[PDB]
Amino acid sequence: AKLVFFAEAAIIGLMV
Amino acid sequence: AKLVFFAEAAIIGLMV
Amino acid sequence: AKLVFFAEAAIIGLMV
Amino acid sequence: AKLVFFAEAAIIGLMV
Amino acid sequence: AKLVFFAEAAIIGLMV
Amino acid sequence: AKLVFFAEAAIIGLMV
Amino acid sequence: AKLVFFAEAAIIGLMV
Amino acid sequence: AKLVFFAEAAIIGLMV
Amino acid sequence: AKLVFFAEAAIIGLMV
Amino acid sequence: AKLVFFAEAAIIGLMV
Amino acid sequence: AKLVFFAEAAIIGLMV
Amino acid sequence: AKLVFFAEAAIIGLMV
Amino acid sequence: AKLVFFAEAAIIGLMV
Amino acid sequence: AKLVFFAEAAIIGLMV
Amino acid sequence: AKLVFFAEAAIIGLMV
Amino acid sequence: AKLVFFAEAAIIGLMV
Amino acid sequence: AKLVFFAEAAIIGLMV
Amino acid sequence: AKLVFFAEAAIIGLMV
Amino acid sequence: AKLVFFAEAAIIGLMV
Amino acid sequence: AKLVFFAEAAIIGLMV
Amino acid sequence: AKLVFFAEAAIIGLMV
Amino acid sequence: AKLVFFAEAAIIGLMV
Amino acid sequence: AKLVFFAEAAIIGLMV
Amino acid sequence: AKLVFFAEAAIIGLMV
Numbered sequence A, B, C, D, E, F, G, H, I, J, K, L, M, N, O, P, Q, R, S, T, U, V, W, X: 001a002k003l004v005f006f007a008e009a010a011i012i013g014l015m016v
């Protein structure tokens, strides 16, 4: 799956 | 180059 | 914000 | 998984 | 139609 | 900002 | 409109 | 050839 | 999953 | 809507 | 910021 | 629908 | 110049 | 095949 | 030419 | 023609 | 933010 | 699943 | 780099 | 047919 | 302007 | 390679 | 006109 | 790399 990253702090990566 | 991330485990970052 | 990645080496993650 | 949205009314969110 | 979401508050879903 | 949704369960929406 | 096909079962064709 | 779909109703699948 | 069609005759649809 | 032209004969213009 | 336009009538211009 | 602007004079906004 | 087509009916071909 | 138009006058359409 | 809008306040549109 | 690959096992490539 | 440049002379860059 | 290809040498085909 | 496949015979893989 | 160009040196123009 | 090539033989390039 | 500009300050131009 | 940038070194900005 | 052509004169081919 592709991996998408967000900066919220904390960085979280979500799978696609 | 653009960096594209995948998750398979292990992360793989591939480039453009 | 979403993190967009480039590689030039240095990896750069910029926030959208 | 990422949720992709369409509208046809019914709203449909499909998972990638 | 494709449904595109925005956040301004309030959520706004606009279509294609 | 644009809104991106993921199904993880729980649905979470992240801003861009 | 463009027609986009998905498989979930059942086929779902959504439009643009 | 790949089949590309439109809807106008009539459904049209054209070959690429 | 997304559905992709090909004309080979016989029409075959492959999942993504 | 965007208009997309094809040639098969006859011309077919399909829309988005 | 860039202005992105939709029409749903109301015209909506959202800022990026 | 997405709204696309052109300048020719006069402005013309066309949609998707 | 390239001709880009929309339909709104009136067909509009704009030059790029 | 897809049809691409150009304004050169005279309008000419080329197949893809 | 295409028209691109920015919010700077004042809204300014630039031609492409 | 472009070549598209699928993993079904067996890998099959379809022409476009 | 992304940076977009225009030639108007004077070159001006607008943020996105 | 569809196979997406990169080259970094090693050729990598990842499944969608 | 992204790898793009074509079929002409012989296969040709070209890169981005 | 449209000619698509790559460079790998050799320049390659492939027909669509 | 961008340059687009077609194979018709004779190769012809059209400006955009 | 394509050059993409960002503003953070300082300008950063990253490539494809 | 919009300025599109490449790098080949020389930086080239072309006008659209 | 993809090769992109422009016309200014002189032809300039730039790459991705």
Ligand SMILES: [Cl-]
Residues within 6 Å of the ligand: C001, C002, C016, F001, F015, F016
């Ligand atoms: Cl945000």
Ligand SMILES: [Cl-]
Residues within 6 Å of the ligand: C008, C009, C010
């Ligand atoms: Cl280095």
Ligand SMILES: [Cl-]
Residues within 6 Å of the ligand: C002, C004, C016
């Ligand atoms: Cl993005």
Ligand SMILES: [Cl-]
Residues within 6 Å of the ligand: A001, A015, A016, D001, D002, D016
């Ligand atoms: Cl997942």
Ligand SMILES: [Cl-]
Residues within 6 Å of the ligand: D008, D009, D010
């Ligand atoms: Cl209804």
Ligand SMILES: [Cl-]
Residues within 6 Å of the ligand: D002, D004, D016
């Ligand atoms: Cl997606």
Ligand SMILES: [Cl-]
Residues within 6 Å of the ligand: H001, H002, H016, P001, P015, P016
């Ligand atoms: Cl074929």
Ligand SMILES: [Cl-]
Residues within 6 Å of the ligand: H008, H009, H010
């Ligand atoms: Cl009908």
Ligand SMILES: [Cl-]
Residues within 6 Å of the ligand: H002, H004, H016
């Ligand atoms: Cl296609």
Ligand SMILES: [Cl-]
Residues within 6 Å of the ligand: K001, K002, K016, Q001, Q015, Q016
């Ligand atoms: Cl801004």
Ligand SMILES: [Cl-]
Residues within 6 Å of the ligand: K008, K009, K010
């Ligand atoms: Cl109304």
Ligand SMILES: [Cl-]
Residues within 6 Å of the ligand: K002, K004, K016
């Ligand atoms: Cl944008």
Ligand SMILES: [Cl-]
Residues within 6 Å of the ligand: M001, M002, M016, U001, U015, U016
């Ligand atoms: Cl021209």
Ligand SMILES: [Cl-]
Residues within 6 Å of the ligand: M008, M009, M010
């Ligand atoms: Cl009407």
Ligand SMILES: [Cl-]
Residues within 6 Å of the ligand: M002, M004, M016
């Ligand atoms: Cl165009």
Ligand SMILES: [Cl-]
Residues within 6 Å of the ligand: I001, I015, I016, R001, R002, R016
């Ligand atoms: Cl699958």
